[PDB]
């Protein structure tokens, strides 16, 4: 048996938090993958207080 | 048996939070994928207090 | 047996939260995918206090 | 057995929350997909206090 | 049996936190992958208070 | 017995609050007075978020 | 017994608060007074977030 | 017994707070006074986040 | 017994706080006074985060 | 018994705090006084983070 409980309220409760994000020409070319890929939290841009949870049992056959 | 309980209220309860996000020419070209891909939270733009959770058991056959 | 309960009210109850989001020419061209793809919360634009949860058991055959 | 109960009232009850979202020429063209894709919350524009939940058990055959 | 419970409230409750992120022309070309790849939290852009957790048992056959 | 248990946090919780005060030539005079005098909060200038409490049982014998 | 148990953390919690004060020639005269006088919080200037308390049992026997 | 247990941490928690004070020729006079006088917090200037407490049982015998 | 148990750590916790004070010719005269006088916190200048307390039981026998 | 147990570490915890003071010709006079006088914190200058306490039981026999 699996399981992943998460506890109570989070979040900013204090001072100052500033985030600037100015990339110029980011490129990400991907091709020809084969298998599965799990991930809890993927942040390719700008994130703050992002919680993610993933569960997977995939069966892939060729 | 699976399961992922999440607890009570999150969210800002404090000071200041500012987010600027100005990319110029981000490019992301992907092609020729094969298998499954789970994810809890995908944030490609701008996010704040983002909660995500995924559960999946896929079967893919060719 | 699966399950993913979520608890009570979240949301801003504090100070100041500002989000600017000005991409110039973001391009995302994807082609030739094959398999399933789960996701809890996908945010490609601007989000705040976004909760999402997905559940899937798909069977794909070729 | 499945099930994803959500609890009571959420929402802003505090200070200030401002969101500007001005992309210039975003392009997202996709083609040649094959299989299923679930998602709890998809926000491609501007969102705030968005709750989504999806359950799917599709069978796709070719 | 697996399992990964998490702690209670987290988040800024103190002083000042500033993050600038201005890459010039980051490129990431990946191709011809073979197998599974799990990850807890992938941050390719800008992140702050990002919590991720993934559990996966995939079976891939050729 | 007695007691005035003030409680709770208070203060500005968002919004705009402007206070102006330009009296020309205010005056006040009290020549002969005698006896007790107790006040909770007395404001002669601007004020603002002001809390005050007083508790007095004097004995005066002429 | 007696007692005024103030409590809680207070103060500005976000927003704008502007206070202006330009009295020209304010005056205040008191010539002959006699007896007790108790006050909780007295402000003749700006003030702002002000808290004050007082407890007094004088005995005077002119 | 007596006692005024002030408690809690207080102060500015984000936002803007501007205080101005430009009186030209304020005046004040008190010629003949006699008796007790107790105050919690007296502000003749700007003030700001000010806390004060006073406890007094004088016995005056003319 | 007596006692005023102040507690907690306090002070500025983020934000902007500007205080200005330009009185031109303030004055204050007191000629003849007699008797006790107790104060918690007296501010004749700027002030700022100011805390004060006072306990007194004088016995005066003109 | 007595006792005023101040506690906790305090001070500026992030943010901006500017204090200005340019009074032109302030004045103050006291000619004839007699009796007790107790104060917690008295400021005539800028002040700032100031804490003060006082305890006094004088006996004056004219």
Curated annotation (Swiss-Prot), chains A, B, C, D, E, F, G, H, I, J:
This is Major prion protein. Monomer and homodimer. Has a tendency to aggregate into amyloid fibrils containing a cross-beta spine, formed by a steric zipper of superposed beta-strands. Soluble oligomers may represent an intermediate stage on the path to fibril formation. Copper binding may promote oligomerization. Interacts with GRB2, APP, ERI3/PRNPIP and SYN1. Mislocalized cytosolically exposed PrP interacts with MGRN1; this interaction alters MGRN1 subcellular location and causes lysosomal enlargement. Interacts with KIAA1191. Interacts with ADGRG6. Changing residue 48 to V: Protective factor against Kuru; protective factor against prion disease; confers protection against classical Creutzfeldt-Jakob disease (CJD) and Kuru in the heterozygous state but can be infected with variant CJD prions resulting from exposure to bovine spongiform encephalopathy prions; confers complete resistance to all prion strains when homozygous; acts as a 'dominant negative' inhibitor of prion conversion; is not only itself resistant to conformational conversion, but also inhibits conversion of wild-type proteins. Sequence repeats lie at residues 5-12. The glycosylation pattern (the amount of mono-, di- and non-glycosylated forms or glycoforms) seems to differ in normal and CJD prion. The gene is PRNP. This protein is produced by a bicistronic gene which also produces the alternative prion protein/AltPrP (AC F7VJQ1) from an overlapping reading frame. The alternative prion protein/AltPrP (AC F7VJQ1) and PRNP have no apparent direct functional relation since a mutation that removes the start codon of the AltPrP has no apparent effect on the biology of PRNP. In mouse and hamster, the alternative initiation AUG codon is absent and is replaced by a GUG codon. It is found in: Cell membrane; Golgi apparatus. It comes from Homo sapiens (Human). The normal, monomeric form, PRPN(C), has a mainly alpha-helical structure. Misfolding of this form produces a disease-associated, protease-resistant form, PRPN (Sc), accompanied by a large increase of the beta-sheet content and formation of amyloid fibrils. These fibrils consist of a cross-beta spine, formed by a steric zipper of superposed beta-strands. Disease mutations may favor intermolecular contacts via short beta strands, and may thereby trigger oligomerization. Contains an N-terminal region composed of octamer repeats. At low copper concentrations, the sidechains of His residues from three or four repeats contribute to the binding of a single copper ion. Alternatively, a copper ion can be bound by interaction with the sidechain and backbone amide nitrogen of a single His residue. The observed copper binding stoichiometry suggests that two repeat regions cooperate to stabilize the binding of a single copper ion. At higher copper concentrations, each octamer can bind one copper ion by interactions with the His sidechain and Gly backbone atoms. Belongs to the prion family. Its primary physiological function is unclear. May play a role in neuronal development and synaptic plasticity. May be required for neuronal myelin sheath maintenance. May promote myelin homeostasis through acting as an agonist for ADGRG6 receptor. May play a role in iron uptake and iron homeostasis. Soluble oligomers are toxic to cultured neuroblastoma cells and induce apoptosis (in vitro). Association with GPC1 (via its heparan sulfate chains) targets PRNP to lipid rafts. Also provides Cu(2+) or Zn(2+) for the ascorbate-mediated GPC1 deaminase degradation of its heparan sulfate side chains. The lineage of its organism: Eukaryota, Metazoa, Chordata, Craniata, Vertebrata. It is linked to PrP is found in high quantity in the brain of humans and animals infected with neurodegenerative diseases known as transmissible spongiform encephalopathies or prion diseases, like: Creutzfeldt-Jakob disease (CJD), fatal familial insomnia (FFI), Gerstmann-Straussler disease (GSD), Huntington disease-like type 1 (HDL1) and kuru in humans; scrapie in sheep and goat; bovine spongiform encephalopathy (BSE) in cattle; transmissible mink encephalopathy (TME); chronic wasting disease (CWD) of mule deer and elk; feline spongiform encephalopathy (FSE) in cats and exotic ungulate encephalopathy (EUE) in nyala and greater kudu. Cu(2+) 4 binds at residues 6-8.
